[PDB]
């Protein structure tokens, strides 16, 4: 028998029936913190230092490790491109802070795409443009300060392969598509027009099935999520493909009494982790 | 006695006299291939591969190792800056080919400054601009093809700290200075106005006291010199300071009979070796 079944190479063993020389012709048969509940760093004044930069959190049980997996360089068993990759390390795996957003009582919510956010920032950006192939994980840190008299709750989540959709002309008759500035808004991010369906026909209420953390003003002022590289290929174009989107949505609206500070910003600070590149040539912006 | 003599820390031992608590107050006393003759790679179709690039020479006894020292990263004993450096490796230590020069029967000679030549080229350039501190060695490869009926000889030499001077207004009364485009001509290099004195009041005839190789058309079509990092400090600005100049001077003029190919170019291909950077910040061009 040829070992060409789709399940060949998995830890689970199935008992199947077959009458042909190819394994995939066989019957499906029968088989014979949790990765999905946003595992905290512990389950798997504080200071996270990476490169020449340091942010300050409070607890390791407050850092989510997406899918329970820490970022890593691509192993030889999964690699396919044969050139030696460049792993610049400290010049690219460090914290970059993007433009700050302003949280208002009627804000809808925002999203950023990765690695799009940094393709034009620092040495990371340069490497992303000079190489065809890119790969990395990310430490995502969202910051929001308010007083003990303010209230509100942001859901901060990482949605892998965040494909956006349109309102189809309102009536649903128009097969319109999101424009480039909407699918890859860059460093400044973009605003959601229908946060309830994440501008993609899926419920915000179930977004917690993805790696996430809440920023509930009365309890915390920051959220930190560590994201491993996720894709169906070991390396990919940092320009053509965004591996995941970061969503920051006010599920419980911001509120405070008149006279309390009304300028409440939200700041995103991100650090590539284990960034590596391959397929060197001239710089390409898109 | 305080061990504060200028010779403290050298391999040579001197027998001196002293009457004071400070060692430097002491008398000079008495003490008690060759590095300068351009050591070949052997003394210390061929293919030199570095990064994603390969050049083809012929012999290892045809590669000069300047001062008999191979490029190396800065050792901890000599380092002073405390941040972890970035050593991008294959994206910067690889061969870059500059604009080709045209050798004419009356050409004076050319020079290029390092690392100026590559501060705006590739990932090396980006790192040189994003970091305050830079350091590296270089593999310098000069190419010139001609027929068995052509004749001529180029002296290819590396002059550390190649400070240029002016003709002082011709009369010698004007304290003029070389302009920026002359001291750091960039990738295209520059032409010598008085090659006999290297545009610096010193004899071209003694330039062979520096690492060099001849390109004598009847025998060879290329010269390769490997240069270690040389400076009075372990790292320095790639923008403000050029560690050495590359000089290509036709000591025996090009000649050939009418009808033989008259377009005889000279091409320079260089590869940074062990390039490292530190003191990261925003990109600075100069």
């Amino acid at each position: 028998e040829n070992s060409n079944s789709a399940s060949e190479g998995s830890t689970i063993n199935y008992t199947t029936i077959n009458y042909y020389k190819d394994a995939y012709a066989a019957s499906a048969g029968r088989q014979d913190a949790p990765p999905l509940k946003s595992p905290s760093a512990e389950a798997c004044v504080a200071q996270l230092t990476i490169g020449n930069s340091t942010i300050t959190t409070q607890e390791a049980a407050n850092i989510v490790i997406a899918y329970g997996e820490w970022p890593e360089y691509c192993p030889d068993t999964d690699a396919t491109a044969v050139d030696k990759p460049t792993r610049p390390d400290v010049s690219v795996n460090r914290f970059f802070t993007l433009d700050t957003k302003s949280w208002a009582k009627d804000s809808k919510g925002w999203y950023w795409k990765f690695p799009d956010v940094l393709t034009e920032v620092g040495v990371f950006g340069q490497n992303a443009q000079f190489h065809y192939l890119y790969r990395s994980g990310f430490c995502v840190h969202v910051q929001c300060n308010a007083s003990k008299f303010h209230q509100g709750a942001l859901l901060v989540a990482v949605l892998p392969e965040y494909v956006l959709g349109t309102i189809a002309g309102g009536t649903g008759n128009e097969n319109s598509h999101p424009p480039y500035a909407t699918t890859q808004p860059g460093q400044v991010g973009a605003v959601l027009t229908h946060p309830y369906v994440l501008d993609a026909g899926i419920p915000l209420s179930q977004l917690t099935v993805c790696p996430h953390q809440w920023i509930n003003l009365r309890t915390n002022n920051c959220a930190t999520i560590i994201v491993p590289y996720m894709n169906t290929v070991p390396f990919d174009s940092a320009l053509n493909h965004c591996n995941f989107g970061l969503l920051v949505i006010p599920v419980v609206p911001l509120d405070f009494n008149t006279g309390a500070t009304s300028e409440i910003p939200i700041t995103v600070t991100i650090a590539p982790m284990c960034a590596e590149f391959a397929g060197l040539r001239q710089a390409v912006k898109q | 006695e305080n061990s504060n003599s200028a010779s403290e820390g050298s391999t040579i031992n001197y027998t001196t006299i002293n009457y004071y608590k400070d060692a430097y107050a002491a008398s000079a006393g008495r003490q008690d291939a060759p590095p300068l003759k351009s050591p070949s790679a052997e003394a210390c179709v061929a293919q030199l591969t570095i990064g994603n690039s390969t050049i083809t020479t012929q012999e290892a006894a045809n590669i000069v190792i300047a001062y008999g020292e191979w490029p190396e990263y800065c050792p901890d004993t000599d380092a002073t800056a405390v941040d972890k450096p970035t050593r991008p490796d294959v994206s910067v230590n690889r061969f870059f080919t500059l604009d080709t020069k045209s050798w004419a029967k009356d050409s004076k000679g050319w020079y290029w400054k390092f690392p100026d030549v590559l501060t705006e080229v590739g990932v090396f350039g980006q790192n040189a601009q994003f970091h305050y501190l830079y350091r590296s060695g270089f593999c310098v490869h000069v190419q010139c093809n001609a027929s068995k009926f052509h004749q001529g000889a180029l002296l290819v030499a590396v002059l550390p700290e190649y400070v240029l001077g002016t003709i002082a207004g011709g009369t010698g009364n004007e304290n003029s200075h070389p302009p920026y485009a002359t001291t750091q001509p960039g990738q295209v290099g520059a032409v010598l106005t008085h090659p006999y004195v290297l545009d610096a009041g010193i004899p071209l005839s003694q330039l062979t006291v520096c690492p060099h190789q001849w390109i004598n058309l009847r025998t060879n079509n290329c010269a390769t010199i490997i240069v270690p990092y040389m400076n009075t400090v372990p790292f320095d600005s790639a923008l403000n300071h050029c560690n050495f100049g590359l000089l290509v001077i036709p000591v025996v003029p090009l000649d050939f009979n009418t009808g033989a190919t008259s377009e005889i170019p000279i091409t320079v291909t260089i590869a940074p070796m062990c390039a490292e950077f530190a003191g990261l910040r925003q990109a600075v061009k100069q």
Binding site: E72, Y73, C74, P75, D76, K84, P85, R87 | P34, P35
Partner: peptide
């Protein structure tokens, strides 16, 4: 164990001359 495999010139006196 490792996921990635790729990761004195002048002496005190002048030289003597030897008979051929």
């Amino acid at each position: 164990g490792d996921p990635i495999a790729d990761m004195l010139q002048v002496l005190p006196t002048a030289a003597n001359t030897e008979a051929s």
